[PDB]
Ligand SMILES: *Cc1cc2c(cc1C)nc1c(=O)[nH]c(=O)nc-1n2C[C@H](O)[C@H](O)[C@H](O)COP(=O)(O)OP(=O)(O)OC[C@H]1O[C@@H](n2cnc3c(N)ncnc32)[C@H](O)[C@@H]1O
Ligand SMILES: *Cc1cc2c(cc1C)nc1c(=O)[nH]c(=O)nc-1n2C[C@H](O)[C@H](O)[C@H](O)COP(=O)(O)OP(=O)(O)OC[C@H]1O[C@@H](n2cnc3c(N)ncnc32)[C@H](O)[C@@H]1O
């Protein structure tokens with residue numbers, strides 16, 4: 001074949017397609033028995049359950065183009081109802097929006113802390129974070145260190161910490177300031193990452209995200225997609241690339257590897273990857289998230305005038321969301337254990353995580369939250385073919401020293417994945433970008 | 448079929464393989480390279496021994512010290528005598544009988560109070576469970592770099608400290624959680640233990656070099672125990688034991704000890720897949736970045752000039768140098784390293800280019816005689832596919848308190864060794880030895 005793509009996520013599949021329609025031969029070798037990767041949809045209780053990525057919002061041009069091209073309808077994330085905020089061994093507070101549980105002072109400082117991180121972000125080149133003028137200072141500094149500088153009160157530092165852990169699936173301490181700043185630039189600012197209406201959590205897909213990936217996969221000729229076919233090894237010479245699977249061997253001119261960084265370095269590369277790139281991947285840890293859907297017979301919180309959104313900065317769950325489909329049943333409360341609370345939850349059983357979620361909801365939405373019909377969750381850290389969501393972060397010292405290896409081809413081996421995107425890195429939209437860019441590269445470099 | 452399969456023929460893998468055989472259980476050691484030693488590696492050049500890998504032992508290192516004397520490898524002192532050369536930025540190189548004496552009264556105070564103030568953090572950091580320090584949460588949330596900045600020392604002081612940090616950790620004070628650095632320091636017995644060249648980790652060398660001593664540990668295994676050029680690709684456990692997949696078939700065991708660097712450990716195909724906290728721990732244990740060099744001269748000409756052969760350069764690509772001349776007294780060798788970002792830059796250049804860079808430093812520090820070079824030999828340990836960086840792993844902020852607890856936890860019938868798992872002299876040969884003895888006991892107790 002002309003091109004072998006490793007991975008049938010949105011990055012893999014988008015690269016495989018652009019290569020196919022250009023007039024070139026391609027195989028996609030995928031480890032799982034399905035497509036979609038970090039997107040994954042299961043039917044439960046008469047509706048779709050997005051165990052992985054579910055949300056699209058404005059500014060995400062490429063996924064909105066894909067959904068529309070392939071005949072997939074969207075519905076809004078519900079917005080109406082009183083939100084509940086809970087601090088410490090305090091009582092729960094009902095407001096028409098989270099924001100209105102904080103003082104005048106507290107809100108000011110919050111929006112000024114966001115406005116401040118955006119200032120840094122705007123100066124970070126999306127294609128080359130290492131080339132910001134303040135790159136030295138910013139890559140030696142954690143986000144936590146920077147927040148502590150702002151001299152913001154504990155309750156505004158707590159609120160900002162819930163938003164950090166909900167966006168990166170890692171604490172402010174794990175991230176370089178330069179990584180955080182690049183990610184905010186990439187998304188078009190803090191409100192773009194955090195908001196529902198006008199934000200990344202604005203819209204969902206009717207029937208869920210995994211079907212959109214399947215529709216993209218059906219644009220490939222029969223025999224192009226190989227499922228349950230993990231790539232163990234990747235060899236290359238001046239003539240082409242030999243892909244060793246278990247029970248088979250594939251031979252192409254060039255390769256696109258579209259897996260999560262930590263899985264990319266697990267492949268037996270021959271010759272061995274250059275050291276800057278091998279060490280970049282040792283410095284690109286995946287985040288830590290357990291995503292859950294609490295299932296009730298009905299969205300009983302709405303009848304109390306409640307949105308179903310709780311925000312508890314001291315609880316092991318950060319933010320919740322009404323995940324009820326457009327038909328109005330079953331009622332769903334969707335949420336996440338993020339960073340350290342996700343690692344602790346992952347070490348426990350399904351039933352122990354259910355009891356923690358239901359306890360928090362009972363003390364916020366109401367005691368009726370213990371009357372659960374079903375609980376459905378996924379630890380993406382446990383998934384051998386992801387090993388953490390939503391994607392990689394870089395700790396201090398990674399971006400300026402190993403980061404330049406991010407996108408550079410090694411010979412005939414090219415790189416895709418949301419982690420290689422300029423815009424909405426970390427999101428489906430970013431995956432799509434990476435696919436388009438990796439394919440353009442291989443068409444150019446081939447003929 | 449055997450009782451135990453050890454992955455890695457380094458000092459941790461062999462030390463464990465030894466204590467398993469000595470207990471009367473069958474063992475097979477599987478090693479990806481055509482040799483033993485691992486991060487220790489010695490070659491014959493110019494009629495002497497060239498340690499590309501680990502080389503030094505010193506006081507407190509009671510394991511390696513006793514393994515040496517047992518298998519009969521004699522030691523020789525690292526030379527201490529002659530002026531050291533210190534050099535900051537744009538300034539004039541300073542000769543002093545020791546590095547310290549090139550600093551003001553005021554500077555050396557600030558430096559010593561800096562090391563004291565770190566050692567007092569180190570003292571409350573449990574060697575067995577760093578995550579159980581009273582203030583573990585706060586210390587894990589801080590870099591080494593952030594904490595130094597908070598002590599408020601002068602720059603020369605912070606840069607001299609930085610030189611030392613990178614000579615120990617092979618990574619910047621920004622890459623390291625303070626908690627990780629404090630544990631590393633407690634594990635050694637202090638900053639003097641780590642940085643001194645006498646009463647410290649750089650006091651003594653091994654006659655014939657280090658790979659040999661691991662060859663003498665290998666030779667005390669049964670015939671057929673060791674398969675070199677046998678990399679482990681896959682490890683499958685069920686109720687009755689583990690199945691170790693290589694390229695050339697399978698090897699059934701009751702229990703496995705994996706004794707490879709933590710980054711190499713994670714790349715193995717585990718079945719079932721490893722528990723999340725463990726897999727993600729490995730994701731958070733990156734190896735350091737180090738290129739180690741030896742500059743061959745016909746004679747140690749520098750002893751003529753009343754010079755040690757040690758240069759200390761905070762602002763050059765070359766960190767710390769050491770007189771590497773064998774006791775025979777020829778050839779002259781200047782031993783040194785590129786550390787951290789300097790290792791990664793140098794790593795992407797050729798051997799010839801890295802040679803020019805070191806000679807250019809040496810000539811402006813030791814003198815013009817440094818150009819009359821016989822030969823240059825170096826090794827990029829980041830570039831080795833069965834190491835992927837020396838000296839060992841570091842942990843960034845948040846790693847130790849959240850993922851740390853999985854570090855020694857056995858996973859069904861698979862157990863963990865390597866210097867990264869030692870409580871004492873973690874990151875050294877002596878800590879590999881400890882991890883081997885420890886891993887062995889666990890597996891013997893669990894067999895019977
Ligand atoms: C996990 C997650 C992600 C997510 C999120 C919530 C969770 C819990 N919410 C999101 C959302 O609402 N909106 C959004 O846009 N993104 C959200 N994220 C992240 C998003 O899902 C991802 O950024 C996107 O899916 C990334 O796609 P990409 O194509 O870059 O990566 P992938 O999905 O991991 O695909 C990799 C494929 O590679 C296969 N694999 C792995 N190793 C191998 C080998 N050795 N051989 C062959 N195939 C391999 C995987 O199985 C996978 O299919
Ligand atoms: C690299 C280095 C190390 C070193 C140092 C300078 C350099 C450049 N200076 C030191 C010094 O003066 N004194 C000292 O005590 N240590 C020094 N360091 C550190 C030292 O070398 C290490 O702490 C020590 O070597 C630790 O080794 P350990 O026994 O824990 O294991 P290893 O040496 O890394 O070897 C592991 C072996 O496993 C093999 N391997 C890897 N993957 C596989 C697979 N998949 N299958 C089979 N075998 C595998 C490796 O090839 C290696 O042999």
Ligand SMILES: [Mg+2]
Nearest residue numbers: 078079080196
């Ligand atoms: Mg709302």
